């Protein structure tokens, strides 16, 4: 499908993976990522890299990325839209660890704090050590990281511009 | 000649910032400034390395800290002061005509590029260097001697050219040049937003559990001074394979990239300097690289 | 307003040095209370002793 390059330039200021995640954090919300666009990076490699590359098939325009990535003006490249045959689209990948598991086992199964603590005691720790963006959600005010990996291709996306199901 | 520089040469700073001032107005309401401060948040316990069973006791005196715009303004105020001062030729430390045949050898320097460059970098707001990203609008207003300038858009790296920033380098090259003093009061203005994430200075954590440690000043979200200076320090582009302006090191030694800009062909401070003491006639963009650290002071004997 | 370096003459200053001298000279003591304001500016650095 045909894409769009979006490039962090060289910044000395701050983290090129903290351009990144301010990126995929406004490029979230606002709008792009309907269900078609989504972003793929060339650079994926410890890091998430610095080019980012949006490719809806529909078709992804500059003016509305140039517009709306503007307060990234200052340290934002935007390619001109080209074409491929595969982009190598990445998921989204969960880490567990825990107290989520310990609340949600109290409150499914009815077991008490000390019964789900017992019956996870010897379990969970997960660490995923995959190529990451940290991202602050709106909906729930936290922040946390998003972990990325290499999937199958699938027909449908979410509102960070991975894959779905 | 073989002049030697003597065993403890030292210079002062010429420079001197203050620390700045976090504030929260409104952009067309700039006269309800109000106290940005740093709150704790839960966070402690469970260290939690794999294995390493002697670091795991680690005793939890933890709250990492946090720092927000109030929702009811948007605009940030940043608020600090530039002293300026002149005799740039003050060897604290030493003295004994080593320093004075470097004056002499370092009187034809063009104090002028200097100048507007230091200023530049204000006008500029390179400062900020974290609430810079994603702004909407920046006005820096600089009250040089009672006339409030304001400033806007002007590029980082790029010197353009611009005649009010001129203007207040008139008044900086005459202090550089000989002896004198100026204080400058700048004011930023950035329109980030209700309940944006301020950068505050992040502060030294030792062997600890903390991650988010702040710098405050007294309860008040604040940044530090030596940061200020080095984003007025960040104009060396005479080095080995000049690309953006980085920050002038005697040895071009920027660590965050654990690099040595200076130190390689032979353009580190002591060797220009002891070539132009005892007889080596330099270019103009390398001896003011000379004058640039001498402004910034150090020890420069040994 | 004082020059720091070049001595010039000042009658105020004289008055005290002459209640100065007699004590040197002769015997008995004199003992004079200084206060310096400075000008300097919102938060400027100052410099103590060091150790």
Same mark, same amino acid.
């Given at each position: 499908?045909?894409?769009?390059?979006?490039?962090?330039?060289?910044? *000395?200021?701050?983290?090129?993976?903290?351009?990144?995640? #301010?990126?995929?954090?406004?490029?979230?919300?606002?709008?792009?990522?309907?269900?078609?666009?989504?972003?793929?990076?060339?650079?994926?490699?410890?890091?998430?890299? *610095?080019?980012?590359?949006?490719?809806?098939?529909?078709?992804?325009?500059?003016?509305?990325?140039?517009?709306?990535?503007?307060?990234?003006? *200052?340290?934002?490249?935007?390619?001109?839209?080209? @074409?491929?045959?595969?982009?190598?689209?990445?998921?989204?990948?969960?880490?567990?660890?825990?107290?989520?598991?310990?609340?949600?086992?109290?409150?499914?199964?009815?077991?008490?704090? @000390?019964?789900?603590?017992?019956?996870?005691?010897?379990?969970?720790?997960?660490?995923? #050590?995959?190529?990451?963006?940290?991202?602050?959600?709106?909906?729930?005010?936290?922040?946390?990281?998003?972990?990325? @990996?290499?999937?199958?291709?699938?027909?449908?996306?979410?509102?960070?511009?991975?894959?779905?199901? | 000649?073989? %002049?030697?520089?003597?065993?403890? !040469?030292?210079?002062?700073?010429?420079?001197?910032?203050?620390?700045? %001032?976090?504030?929260?107005?409104?952009?067309?309401?700039?006269?309800?400034?109000?106290?940005?401060?740093?709150?704790?948040?839960?966070?402690?316990?469970?260290?939690?390395?794999?294995?390493?069973?002697?670091?795991?006791?680690?005793?939890?005196?933890?709250?990492?800290?946090?720092?927000?715009?109030?929702?009811?303004?948007?605009?940030? !105020?940043?608020?600090?002061?530039?002293?300026?001062?002149?005799?740039?030729?003050?060897?604290?430390?030493?003295?004994?005509?080593?320093?004075?045949?470097?004056?002499?050898?370092?009187?034809?320097?063009?104090?002028?590029?200097?100048?507007?460059?230091?200023?530049?970098?204000?006008?500029?707001?390179?400062?900020?260097?974290?609430?810079?990203?994603?702004?909407?609008?920046?006005?820096?207003?600089?009250?040089?001697?009672?006339?409030?300038?304001?400033?806007?858009?002007? !590029?980082?790296?790029?010197?353009?050219?611009?005649?009010?920033?001129?203007?207040?380098?008139?008044?900086?090259?005459?202090?550089?040049? /000989?002896?004198?003093?100026?204080?400058?009061?700048?004011?930023?203005?950035? !329109?980030?937003?209700?309940?944006?994430?301020?950068?505050?200075?992040?502060?030294?954590?030792?062997?600890?559990?903390?991650?988010?440690?702040?710098?405050?000043?007294? /309860?008040?979200?604040?940044?530090?001074?030596?940061?200020?200076?080095?984003?007025?320090?960040?104009?060396?582009?005479?080095?080995?394979?000049?690309?953006?302006?980085?920050?002038?090191?005697?040895?071009?030694?920027?660590?965050?990239? =654990?690099?040595?800009?200076?130190?390689?062909?032979?353009?580190?401070?002591?060797? %220009?300097?002891? =070539?132009?003491?005892?007889?080596?006639?330099?270019?103009?963009?390398?001896?003011?690289?000379?004058?640039?650290?001498?402004?910034?002071?150090?020890?420069?004997?040994?």
């Amino acid at each position: 499908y045909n894409t769009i390059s979006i490039t962090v330039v060289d910044a *000395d200021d701050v983290g090129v993976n903290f351009v990144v995640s #301010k990126v995929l954090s406004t490029l979230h919300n606002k709008g792009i990522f309907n269900g078609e666009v989504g972003v793929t990076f060339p650079r994926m490699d410890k890091n998430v890299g *610095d080019i980012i590359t949006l490719f809806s098939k529909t078709g992804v325009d500059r003016k509305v990325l140039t517009s709306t990535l503007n307060t990234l003006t *200052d340290f934002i490249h935007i390619g001109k839209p080209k @074409e491929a045959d595969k982009v190598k689209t990445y998921r989204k990948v969960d880490t567990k660890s825990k107290g989520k598991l310990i609340r949600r086992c109290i409150k499914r199964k009815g077991v008490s704090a @000390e019964t789900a603590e017992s019956l996870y005691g010897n379990y969970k720790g997960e660490k995923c #050590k995959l190529p990451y963006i940290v991202v602050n959600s709106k909906s729930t005010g936290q922040r946390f990281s998003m972990f990325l @990996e290499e999937c199958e291709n699938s027909e449908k996306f979410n509102s960070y511009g991975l894959c779905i199901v | 000649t073989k %002049l030697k520089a003597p065993a403890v !040469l030292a210079y002062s700073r010429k420079i001197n910032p203050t620390n700045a %001032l976090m504030f929260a107005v409104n952009w067309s309401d700039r006269d309800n400034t109000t106290a940005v401060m740093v709150g704790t948040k839960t966070v402690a316990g469970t260290q939690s390395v794999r294995g390493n069973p002697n670091d795991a006791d680690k005793g939890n005196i933890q709250t990492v800290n946090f720092a927000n715009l109030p929702h009811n303004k948007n605009t940030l !105020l940043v608020k600090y002061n530039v002293k300026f001062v002149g005799d740039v030729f003050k060897a604290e430390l030493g003295g004994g005509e080593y320093s004075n045949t470097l004056q002499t050898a370092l009187e034809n320097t063009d104090f002028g590029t200097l100048a507007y460059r230091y200023v530049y970098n204000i006008a500029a707001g390179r400062t900020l260097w974290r609430n810079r990203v994603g702004a909407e609008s920046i006005e820096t207003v600089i009250t040089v001697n009672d006339q409030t300038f304001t400033f806007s858009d002007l !590029l980082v790296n790029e010197f353009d050219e611009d005649v009010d920033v001129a203007e207040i380098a008139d008044m900086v090259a005459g202090v550089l040049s /000989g002896e004198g003093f100026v204080t400058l009061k700048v004011e930023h203005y950035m !329109l980030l937003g209700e309940g944006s994430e301020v950068f505050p200075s992040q502060e030294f954590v030792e062997n600890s559990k903390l991650s988010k440690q702040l710098f405050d000043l007294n /309860g008040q979200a604040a940044m530090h001074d030596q940061k200020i200076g080095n984003a007025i320090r960040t104009i060396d582009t005479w080095y080995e394979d000049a690309t953006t302006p980085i920050a002038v090191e005697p040895y071009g030694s920027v660590v965050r990239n =654990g690099v040595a800009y200076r130190a390689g062909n032979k353009t580190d401070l002591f060797t %220009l300097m002891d =070539g132009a003491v005892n007889g080596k006639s330099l270019t103009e963009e390398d001896q003011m690289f000379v004058t640039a650290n001498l402004i910034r002071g150090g020890v420069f004997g040994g």
